Structure 1
Amino acid sequence: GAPATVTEQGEDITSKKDRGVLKIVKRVGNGEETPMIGDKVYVHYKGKLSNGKKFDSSHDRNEPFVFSLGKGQVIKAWDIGVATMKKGEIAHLLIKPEYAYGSAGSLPKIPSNATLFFEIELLDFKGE
């Protein structure tokens, strides 16, 4: 399924080329612009532990998930991954623990050393 496809086909978007954040594009976005650090971004998403024991969506609230890039609002993998996305893009990300919750984990949802999978749709972004 989607997580195994990212492992086999995903691009390594990390600087260190350690396969910590792997990406595939499921839908090409519009234009060329991608968001800057400090930009307010609006997404829909679905996330899961790569073994599927826990799941989370924005579609629960039926409202965008809003966060600002580079402000420490989200796991490091989201700052890296969303920064690469165009408006309208849908991407899949597979994330190693070093770019998410690490050895500490985050009880009760996230065990130590957890690989995460996300689908993210970048709806819009705006300047601070």
Structure 2
Amino acid sequence: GVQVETISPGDGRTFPKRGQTCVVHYTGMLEDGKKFDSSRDRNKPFKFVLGKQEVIRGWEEGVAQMSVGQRAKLTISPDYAYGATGHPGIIPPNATLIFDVELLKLE
């Protein structure tokens, strides 16, 4: 599944609803592995609509329990991420992923 561990607390009040646009900064890495992406390096926040299956399952269920301002470590098992196929050319089969995610605001 996805384990959410808090790095910095959010407001504890404003949680995303399905259909809202979530605005975040993230860094992704393979568990005990290489870092493969970071929006911080580009300083362009990443945006996605919650509930529409635009992103992997671990983000759908992990960010839905975060409040605005929260920063958290999400550890996501292969079946909540790219599973047995991986993501062509970047993520191998059966990879556990770790993301540092900061929920900046909702739109």
Unaligned runs of at least 5 residues, structure 1: 1-19
**TM-score, normalization by structure 1:** 0.80
**Mapped partners of 2:23, 2:93: distance in 1:** 29
**TM-score, normalization by structure 2:** 0.95
Give the alignment partner of residue 88 of structure 1, picking from 39, 56, 69: 69
Q: Does 1:72 align with 2:53?
A: yes
- Bigger Rg, structure 1 or 2: 1
What SS is found at the alignment partner of 1:23? strand
Alignment size in residue pairs: 107
Q: Are the equivalent residues in 2 in contact too, given 1:54–1:109 (CA < 8 A)?
A: no
Unaligned runs of at least 5 residues, structure 2: none
Q: Are the equivalent residues in 2 in contact too, given 1:45–1:119 (CA < 8 A)?
A: yes
Structure with higher RCO (Cα < 8 A, 6+ apart): 2
Instruction: Please state which structure has a larger fraction of its residues in strand.
Output: 2
Q: Are the equivalent residues in 1 in contact too, given 2:27–2:35 (CA < 8 A)?
A: no
Give the aligned CA root-mean-square deviation in angstroms. 1.0
**After the TM superposition, which parts of structure 1 deviate over 2 Å for at least 4 consecutive aligned residues?**
none
For residue 108 of structure 1, what is the aligned residue in structure 2? 89
Q: How many percent identity over aligned positions?
A: 50
Give the alignment partner of residue 37 of structure 2, picking from 56, 60, 75: 56
Give, in angstroms, the shift of residue 31 of structure 1: 4.4
